[PDB]
Symmetry: C2
Subunit: 122 residues, 2 copies
C-alpha cells in the first residue's frame, strides 16, 4: 500500500535502482539492481540523511531508529540483483526511511553510490 524508490549514483562506476514496498506495518520488500560493482560482497545500508550535497559522505551515519540491510552480492559482471525482505524498514510513521539515503559500500558489511529514498506511485 506504500512504495518508495532510490536511484543510486556516486563518485564511481557504480549505479542502480532500489524499489521498496510495504503494506501497513508489515515487512518491507526491497528490490535491488546495482551495476558496476567489483565482484563479491558489498555492504548495503540505510543512512541517516537524504543529503547528497557533498556526494555520499553528506548522507551521514548508518541509520538507527535496523539500518543494516546486510550484504548484497555482485556477480562476475559487477551486477547485484536481489530481493530482500526486512521488518525494520518502515515507509510510514516516526521512523520512516522516506527522505533518508540508501548507500552501497566498497567493502562487505568507501561509499561507491547512494540515493535519496523518494516516494513513487502506489
Amino acid at each position: 500500500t506504500k512504495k518508495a524508490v532510490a536511484v543510486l549514483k556516486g563518485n564511481s562506476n557504480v549505479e542502480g535502482v532500489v524499489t521498496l514496498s510495504q503494506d501497513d506495518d508489515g515487512p518491507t520488500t526491497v528490490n535491488v539492481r546495482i551495476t558496476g560493482l567489483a565482484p563479491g560482497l558489498h555492504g548495503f545500508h540505510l543512512h541517516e540523511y537524504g543529503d547528497t550535497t557533498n556526494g555520499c559522505m553528506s548522507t551521514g551515519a548508518h541509520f538507527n531508529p535496523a539500518g543494516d540491510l546486510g550484504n548484497i552480492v555482485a556477480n562476475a559482471d559487477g551486477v547485484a540483483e536481489v530481493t530482500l525482505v526486512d521488518n525494520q524498514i518502515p515507509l510510514t510513521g516516526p521512523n520512516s526511511v522516506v527522505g533518508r539515503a540508501l548507500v552501497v559500500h566498497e567493502l562487505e558489511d568507501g561509499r561507491l553510490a547512494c540515493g535519496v529514498v523518494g516516494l513513487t506511485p502506489i
Copy 2:
C-alpha cells in the same frame, strides 16, 4: 526545527541546490541556488514523486501551494534566492519530504523539466 535539502540535476546543463527549513507548522524558508539556466524567469515547482528513474518525467505532476512561483536567473545563468512559503510542510500527512522539486524551461504557467531532485532529510 526541521530541515530538508534537494540536489537538482537533469538532462540539461542545469544543476544546483535547494535547502528548506520550517519551525513547527510555520512558514517554510526555501534557499535556492541553481546554475546553468538561461537568463530570465523559470517556473519552480513541487512535483508529486521523488522518483527520478525516468529522469525528471517520473516525478509525476505538479503537487499541491506546490507552486513556488518563479525564480530569476541572472545574466550568468545563476538563480540565487530565498523564498518564504506557507504551504510547504516538512512534517505531517502533507510533508513534501520524499517528493520532488523541479525547475522548468519556461516561466511559471512551463515547458521542459530542466532539473529536479528528491527532497531529503538533512541535519539539525
